[PDB]
Every structure is written in structure tokens, then in C-alpha cells.
Amino acid sequence: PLARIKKIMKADEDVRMIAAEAPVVFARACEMFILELTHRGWAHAEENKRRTLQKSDIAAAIARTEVFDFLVDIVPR
């Protein structure tokens, strides 16, 4: 979804032009980001012996990951 990754990249302040390679490297970076967030969420879900990945699990993944300290605005801890 190259167009939106550019649209959101320039929607939020960006410095003018975007090289064509930046959204391509971003979608892959977004792909690896969903992985780690989904890996970390389901690890919390499976540790609680639940087979359903719910909204609560992503809050736990953001909470104790210092890598995702910037995401606590979305999840009420």
C-alpha cells in the first residue's frame, strides 16, 4: 500500500519530497513491526492459556516493551 505510506508520511510533517525507495523500505519495516508487536501480543495471550488474540494482549506487549514506549497513548496500560 505505497500511496498511503506516502500520504501518512507527508500528512504528518515531512520535509517536502519523498524518494520512491522510502515507502518501499517502510512497508517492509511496517511488516516487521506488525510481526514483533503481534509476536509479543500473542506470547502474552498464549501465556494466559488463551487461543484468542484480543485488544488486551497488545496493551501488555506495548506496556513492558521499552521499544514501544511511544504507543501507550493508544492502550490504557
Add this chain to the structure above:
Amino acid sequence: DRFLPIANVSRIMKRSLPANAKISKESKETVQECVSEFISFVTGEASDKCQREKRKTINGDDLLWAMTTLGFEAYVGPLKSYLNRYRE
């Protein structure tokens, strides 16, 4: 103008999890906005580096500088081989 990414997030999550694992309605969406926040949090850090050099364009070398400074060391390894191949 904080637009959301596509429903293609659903399918990336499904391939990330084992076969015996299924996903909720709003856990789909929580990631959709956590990855929308991820694009803005990276673009802003790299934009500052671009301005340090009065550069009016943002490239893949800046986004990967941004994720290195912001603390995604697990990402910059594979992403370098992916970006250099895109130019190969």
C-alpha cells in the same frame, strides 16, 4: 490527516501466528493504529536528520538511521539487505 494503513494488516498478523491461533475484531484495529503511529514516529525522527543537512527529501538511509536511533536494532539488519536489493 493521520490516515490508517490498509486491512492488509489483518493478513500480516494471521501469517505471524501459528495455525491454532485466531485474532479478535479490535486487536486487528489496535495494530492498525499502532502501525499508523509507527510511520509518524519514524518519519518525524528522520525528518530532523534531513533538516540537519537542509535536505528536502527523505530516503531509506534516513528511515533506517531513524529506527537505529529510536531502538529497532532487530529491524535494521534485515532492512539493509532489503533496501540494497531494491537498488541492486
